[model samples]
Target: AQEFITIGSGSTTGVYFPVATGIAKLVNDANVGIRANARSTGGSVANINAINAGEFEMALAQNDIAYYAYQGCCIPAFEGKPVKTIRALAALYPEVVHVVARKDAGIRTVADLKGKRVVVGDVGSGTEQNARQILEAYGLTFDDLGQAIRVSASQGIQLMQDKRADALFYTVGLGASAIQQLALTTPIALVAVDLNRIQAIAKKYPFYVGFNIPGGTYKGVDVTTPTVAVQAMLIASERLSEETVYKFMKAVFGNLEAFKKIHPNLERFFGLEKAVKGLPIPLHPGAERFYKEAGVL
Candidate 1:
């Protein structure tokens, strides 16, 4: 008998979708009895929520938000309601906090977002959580913005191109395809988040790490942009049997090289040696068993 599992992935325009698809293919190709399917979603918060509700077996998420969800801490969405069933599978990659602004918007810094129409990612997405936290780090809030447009990254791109939004906050891999598309049509700037502020933000939430977006990652944004990032992670629900979870882990990590090639961001940052590092939630028993046997734990 065979079992089917669904992977909750992020927006189609982001790296999570492709990465999840590649993992599903790898699992299927391995001849594992568990057939996997990667489904596009609104990103971190949604994935976690779905997994908590037993609607998904596995999902991709940002480590920082995963921590909040697991602990049911600060973030309003998870406040005092921890999703205890969530378990970490692997720490995949870093999701850079991109504040892409139109050159004509006069938004040169995070502080400049005041009175500007900004698209903070989808309502229940991790990108939105990041946007809120980043704004808080700068002593700003959605109330400060002239209009806070809550939409997915792809929709944000359209809003920006259509001149309905001034800037957008996207927490994704270095050069997301939708962001690249936005650069093609509009003169944009990748606004930098100061390291000092990142340090302060990390004081409370240690998941944030300083990252640099090199020049030319995106068109017209030809300068290294300093920012903070959160690790992208693979998470599973407790509902999955240990054998099933172990099989899933084996399928993903066993074919490591091929899996990394699924996305450039994964190729650059993902590795078995660091897969267990910076995991915010508790590891699934199956993942622990596999990592121990593989000598990477």
Candidate 2:
């Protein structure tokens, strides 16, 4: 007596997993004849490809990655073949670029890592893409770094704690648990991306928005740090019927308060107005209809 919907989420260490799980809970709790499950997978790029292959009915991806996938440009994975079937569900929150460096590394800015070891996240992942792009903005590349370590955020944290990697780049929601744990156990500095450089990057690549990670968000990082951010968005496959997508939206939005309780970041960043923002791909017909009826269109 139910339809099944599987959501593709990122690794367990980051925000995507919890957010997708929370979404699944909302859909299931609504008793809308939909049984949803969220699975931990590779981040943004993997989720989009999996959705196109019919593995996931929905997934969470970086807004910029979604745009690159739809346009079939920039991102190496979607260089020529665009995944046009993916449609926008919601703009979840700002996935800020957190560049954490060991305090003794003597790194003070993005450019200071020229001859340092850096973890660029899992190869071909969204964080890797952001790392490449942000570094290029500073006229640096993986080749310039002593070593560009490719691993997940969790592993990257370990590398930093062991003093094996000088810095790491992770694009995730503010106060991500992985970063928090690392902050408590390791003496680190939140390197600020130059505001002018970030603005310039935003101009060249429209998906990046200049942002600030406010003071005290992370322990010991008492002052605001400027950076670039991308929206973490929910995207659904076109294979899902409009009725199904609409129902899912209703269940999620209708239970907003309960949904927020599942994750602190959701409460801090999610809202109807923000949900419709940073959408670069076409909206699902069902979601479009729901938003219009709700007067949020």
Candidate 3:
């Protein structure tokens, strides 16, 4: 039987979609004797559950939620049913917390979001959880906001464009197209969730990693902002073959530089040398094989 691998990516507008498609392309282009395709999923939570349920051989996820899924914490449905079958391929890249606010909203800092209409992200999703966690770090909550809509990032971006919302809290690989669309037309302020306080958050939560969005990452934005990031990683079910994973890793990391160039979101943060960094879950034995060979393990 031919090995058919499916990459479980996130939304259409997010980095997962592009990267998974890249994997599909890499496999085919390399003639690696594998059949692969990418599937658009309901983001991190969905991908994790699906992969564990045998719907996918591999998936991309926010490492925080990946941690949650592994521990069966935070997500209601997965509670007490931890996905112990999970194993990591590699830690891929960082996605910063973006609080896209209008310049006139007077939202100068994370603390300034009080009493404003905010989009907290889709209900029960990782984005929603991230919004709650970040607000808690700042001593605020959804109750402190004037209004907090549980809408999609794209939907929240749309609401802000209509002058109907104050700010939208979401995560995306830096230079994500959805947020780029928001900035290109709105002259909005990409508010900084600086590390002065974020380091504490990361200290308390192991899954959160601190990172910064450099000045000039988004159009009309020219000041760096410290923020926390979650790594987007490739995870596989433990049932996947060692040879399958080794071949996949070699095809990816062996041609790593060219793969990074696939998207601007990846370009700034990718490297084969650091492929094993920040993986909360155990490496798949197959991944361990490749990383050991490359001395990345």
Candidate 4:
């Protein structure tokens, strides 16, 4: 018997939409009695809410967001109302913390942005969460800014370029189009996060980890910088049946090589052999079984 599942993914331009679409296609091609359709949506936190509402069976998320949703803290959506029904499926690649600024912004580090005009991500968006946490980690906050704006990536970049903002904190897969495109037109600088502080923040928030952005990824940038990251993840609601999830896992992992090809940076971190790592929430029992038998648990 075949079952149909819906996956909610983030911005169409964001990586997960395509990644989820690829997984859906891979599952369907397997002819394993499981069919999935991936749809573009708001993003990680939104996807989890949809799953909890029963509108989706599974979705991609940042591990930090997933854990907060599970614990019902930090993000107000999960605050004191933890979504115990959510379960982890797999850990995708990491999203680097990109604190982009123009060279002359007088910003030399994460702490320098204090009292400057800045754009955190859109209000309540996962990027905003990242921005908020990063600021908190460095003892900065929305109140610390001369002007704190909430805007999308494209809009935020425009603000910084126009001198209306000092910097913007964007967390996304490496080679995010917004940063890359801005680099083509203007000189951009990355504000590095101090490693000791990064570790301290990660200690409180298990989903966050230290990461390095290699030099030369962007034009004219030639020095590697260390930062923090949160893993992109696949998560499901408990409403899904074990048999259904098991079949879904079999389909994707069975065609694992093809799945890795869906994203350019995936091979650097995405792999079934390492997928189970960093899943802050519990794995769906079905996925657990597959990993056990596949000897990757």
**lDDT (C-alpha, whole model) for all candidates:** 0.88, 0.87, 0.80, 0.80
Index of the highest-lDDT prediction: 1
- The local lDDT score (0 to 100) that residue 277 gets in candidate 3 is 78
Those runs of model 2 whose alpha carbons end farther than 4 Å from true positions after fitting are: 201-203
TM-score of 2: 0.95
What TM-score would every model get versus the actual structure? 0.97, 0.95, 0.89, 0.89
lDDT of 1 by residue, 235-263 (tens): 99988889998888888888778888889
**How well does candidate 3 match the true structure in TM-score terms?**
0.89
The regions of model 4 sitting more than 4 angstroms off are 31-35, 158-164
Clashing pairs in 3: none
Q: Where does candidate 3 have its weakest 10-residue lDDT segment?
A: 196-205
Can you write out model 3's per-residue Cα lDDT over 89-171, one digit (the tens) per residue?
88888877888888888888878889999987665456777788888788898899989897655777888899789898877
TM-score of 4: 0.89
> For residues 96-139, what per-residue lDDT tens digits would candidate 4 score against the true structure?
87888788878888888888898876544577788777888889
For model 4, what is the alpha-carbon lDDT of residue 134?
Answer: 80
Candidate 4, residue 228: lDDT = 82
